[PDB]
Symmetry: D2
Subunit: 305 residues, 4 copies
């Protein structure tokens, strides 16, 4: 198992390190455009192996040749969104980044599984997909796991119960595009609406909606990376160990939810072959409406490309 | 078990995060002098819990009141001797105002010297104030040998005494692969380079990073020490501790093998060093000693 | 942290070994009434330490003095079945209390609900510190069968199971899900019924295969999950056997319900909204558990 | 990765369970001749996955068809030295068991790595090897790791130091055939001769020599299985994760230590290809003599087979 992580920033490096430690791959390549950084971090990670008890070969590079024949490729290239940036501005920029990166990895890696993390997630996962030339089942984006994670931690603070016993159902994208399904959000199998007032739930849902902005507001510069990295790894783990986890990821639909082709966040079974099954849950009218509406917006922006 | 990490920078946050998922403490508090950074990083970590499967209560803060009654305090605060000494001095006086008997692990460079500063400020028995350094050097020495011989790092033991760089004293006779001395597996010339690369290991990362320093190995090294103490494992690890004669060195803090348990330093090991290594070790001790004097 | 495991049999030893590796205690004492068995198994476990990378001090013994001041004590001692095991749990508990003043006691010995009650009254401890393992295991089985049916990770399946073992077991279907999705949404009524039934007879299914003895790997893992919540103060919400004081219309009786496990033991008892059939099933059982206890 | 464990007894089952939890294989098969036991134990293991957090498909069987195409096969079949068995008697019985099993697995698996645990180890590993018809590099036995593990635990009790910082060099076989190399037995790199008196060291070496008997002495019936299981898994892990661990194992030599084709316990580097390197350590005259001497014993026993 060989894994390549494109982008040696906060999210890419944190992800590479976690992957190295869990020994999910014998070879891990950390690539970036800037010379130095990937070489440095990768070496720093490897040098921790004596203590972490892992022999994962972690190397840094600036040459896509080193990524040759990767079984899985994680794209975290780009840059968050400096304060004051425009939606369309970031879209064009990152669309370029993701396209360049994707064309490059396909030049040295055929049939890999691509996991996209770059923002705007839904569109970028689409972009990566179209450039990859692979079946949609091999290109997936990380977003829902992270939103579900924040949602769960907030519910945990509210009730004082372990986060391991909380399920948060989150479909769609981020911000107004996020579609949290309170109906399938449980605590030990019990729906949260059975336990908490609608008013409290609304607050938890909104904090989840702007969860990233909350981190940003504290860090002053940059953005969240521990939860995002952990989330990326959970997906990578299901694929490497063929666990068949059911996680909300950005995948290309083909009819489900009255949506076609567009990349939308939905519960899917992840295995060694990528998206092995897409679940179409019984959303309420409003949620299903928001989901179709947001997917339509994505469809538009994808034409702008 | 309540652990407090001072300094929410690269090593401190990386450490707190590893600490959080290993569930070595029920309460973990990240403190920094800058507002927002610790609160933000701590939240990011906590939000990782649903996925990392841990419930550790990680909180960020700028108020030492939140560090009250800490069992272990890790000081990673710092930007050199003069500036970090003031920082370590300020941090130590603050933690002691809210924690009466913690075990303090210092990582702020210059290590041996800073460890000494924290020790004197804390007013604690030297068995409860140690510095991290040797574990990291040993880890680097180990990864290089692993690259050289193509074997698992888990089966390599690297003995490293002294401080960093020139003051570092790797003991070749006690450096092995599956119990076999390296001088039995490699040309004395290759052993010299591996040794030198270990001496300049920290600078090798810096050069690559261009900004800041290494933190993944340093963080992992710190946690191994924390774990031995928390789980009372009695690991034998080289750390910076106050000597009382061993190696012909007294008072000064120096990197030597020690048995780490729930009570901190429960034993200092004095290994038979040859003339060359003992000379170096002592030489460095006096250097560390002059600096502490001028402080 | 000092944990004592009573009964060095299949469940007790498997539990001790798991505990030793996870390093949830500095001291782990395996005690049995049979000479040599615990000493041997504990030594074998300790010798695994260089490989499992743990330094947990696991020791075997036939002397309760070695269990002194234990924070947590796990009772797996047991070989009519009601009377014999009741005698054993009685003897074990009284012995435990002569050397430990305030431990958290986790009972595993069958018949669970009842043995948990026995241990509780003999211990003289607050009921929040005496619990029995049962629901976690039934739920684990219920979850493993669903995974076989749907081909999904067991980590994303939540099975709600209240009550005791066998016909006393009350699996709540509406609170059993896959990624938050009710199984009734994913499986036919018939398939769900068979899975529920296989869960009811889960224990006998293993026994039938082993001829002698019963399951121990899932039972041990289940116990450890409970111990971990307490040791690490995780506040997990797990179905365990505990003494009720009105919840579900049941009083005094020990029965399996969801509880919040923390460093202080049972920190909260959850009373979920059961449908009429399940609520009556739960109450029926509890009354049976209550009769047996009265006769003891 | 598919792994088969022949024998559902204490060491076989304990090994299967550990393998399942570590997720070292997506498929684990437990086979035995007795109907029931393997099915029951295997089901019990799988039913713990919801709690152990693994999805390893663990199945029990009495049909070698199920072991089809196993990447690794672990032989733990047998039932050695009763309270008065003959070294000869045990040798013949287990020799037939190991061959019957090896022939069976080769009919359903063509290029699997075989790891033997059945006693007498060195001899049974030789048997399995000849039958398998595979290169000697893919047939190894477990013995040195266990003796080394015991040796370390004893040194730990003696000095009050973590077992993780103790290295124990043990070559050869068990009992009289065991060749502990005090010279390469360390604590944080320090030779134990630098730390303990020759008198204490000898006591430690002899306890290691009769370590299995000490367990038997307490259990009254059967024998050790936790340490043995853990040892087998450490080897399996190095192979699966291609860690390149250096562990004392029973492998077919080809010259080193002045020993030819016989299986002897020596430090070897284990990777995905099995025995990737045999280390010939600088033993002292006495130890070197014991090694060749015992090796001869083995040759004599294999001859009359
Ligand atoms: N999926 C989510 O919900 C989620 C969560 C967090 C962050 N993100 C997004 O992930 C990205 C990375 O976040 P970060 O915090 O790690 O950022 P960062 O700025 O720390 O790191 C990005 C890295 O990308 C590299 N890079 C830029 N252009 C490149 C190119 N053409 N090729 C190769 N490498 C290139 C940079 O040099 C940099 O090291 C951002 O776009 C951010 O908005 C998404
Ligand atoms: N012991 C070793 O072998 C070793 C290895 C690596 C780094 N280090 C040292 O550790 C320190 C931290 O390294 P880093 O990479 O994390 O640095 P960094 O620059 O990323 O972070 C340092 C953090 O300290 C904080 N800080 C400064 N003054 C403070 C004060 N008075 N109180 C509380 N917080 C304060 C900053 O605001 C910053 O967030 C440095 O001194 C470095 O040289 C030692
Ligand atoms: N709660 C559950 O869901 C669950 C699951 C599995 C097993 N169990 C029950 O747990 C018990 C143990 O199961 P097992 O498979 O380990 O059995 P086992 O027969 O393997 O072991 C029982 C051990 O108890 C010891 N013992 C007997 N009397 C004792 C006494 N007075 N004091 C101390 N030790 C004594 C024996 O000597 C023996 O080593 C049984 O009663 C069984 O039915 C309950
Ligand atoms: N390598 C070491 O240092 C070491 C350590 C411990 C045990 N061992 C050896 O490992 C073996 C197993 O130990 P155990 O404690 O698990 O014993 P055990 O008696 O509990 O189990 C042996 C299992 O082998 C099965 N079996 C017998 N003949 C078989 C055949 N032809 N095919 C398939 N299965 C068969 C039995 O039915 C039984 O379940 C013994 O030979 C023992 O001496 C070696």
């Amino acid at each position: 198992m060989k894994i390549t992580v494109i982008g040696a920033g906060n999210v890419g490096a944190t992800t590479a390190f976690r992957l190295a430690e869990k020994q999910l791959a014998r070879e891990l390549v950390l690539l970036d455009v800037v010379e130095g950084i990937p070489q440095g971090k990768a070496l720093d990670m490897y040098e921790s192996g004596p203590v972490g008890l892992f022999d994962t070969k972690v190397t840094g590079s600036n040459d896509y040749a080193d990524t040759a024949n990767s079984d899985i490729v994680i794209i975290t290239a780009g840059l968050p969104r400096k304060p004051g940036m425009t939606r369309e501005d970031l879209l064009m920029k990152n669309a370029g980044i993701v396209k360049e990166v994707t064309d490059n990895i396909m030049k040295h890696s055929k049939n890999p599984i691509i996991i996209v993390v770059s923002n705007p997630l839904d569109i970028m996962t689409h972009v990566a997909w179209v450039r990859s030339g692979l079946p949609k089942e091999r290109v997936i984006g990380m977003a829902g796991v992270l939103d579900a994670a924040r949602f769960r931690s907030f519910i945990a603070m509210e009730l004082g119960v372990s986060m391991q016993d909380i399920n948060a159902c989150v479909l769609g994208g981020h911000g107004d595009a996020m579609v949290p399904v309170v109906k399938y959000t449980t605590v030990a199998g019990i729906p949260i609406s059975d336990l908490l007032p609608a008013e409290t739930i609304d607050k938890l849902v909104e904090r989840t909606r702007n969860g990233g902005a909350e981190i940003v507001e504290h860090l002053k510069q940059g953005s969240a990376f521990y939860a995002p990295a952990s989330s990326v790894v959970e997906m990578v783990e299901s694929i490497v160990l063929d666990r068949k986890r059911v996680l909300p990821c950005a995948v290309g639909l083909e009819g489900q939810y009255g949506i076609d082709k567009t990349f939308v966040g939905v519960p899917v079974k992840l295995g060694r072959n990528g998206v092995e099954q897409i679940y179409e849950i019984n959303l309420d009218q409003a949620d299903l409406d928001l989901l179709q509406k947001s997917a339509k917006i994505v469809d538009e922006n994808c034409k702008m490309l």
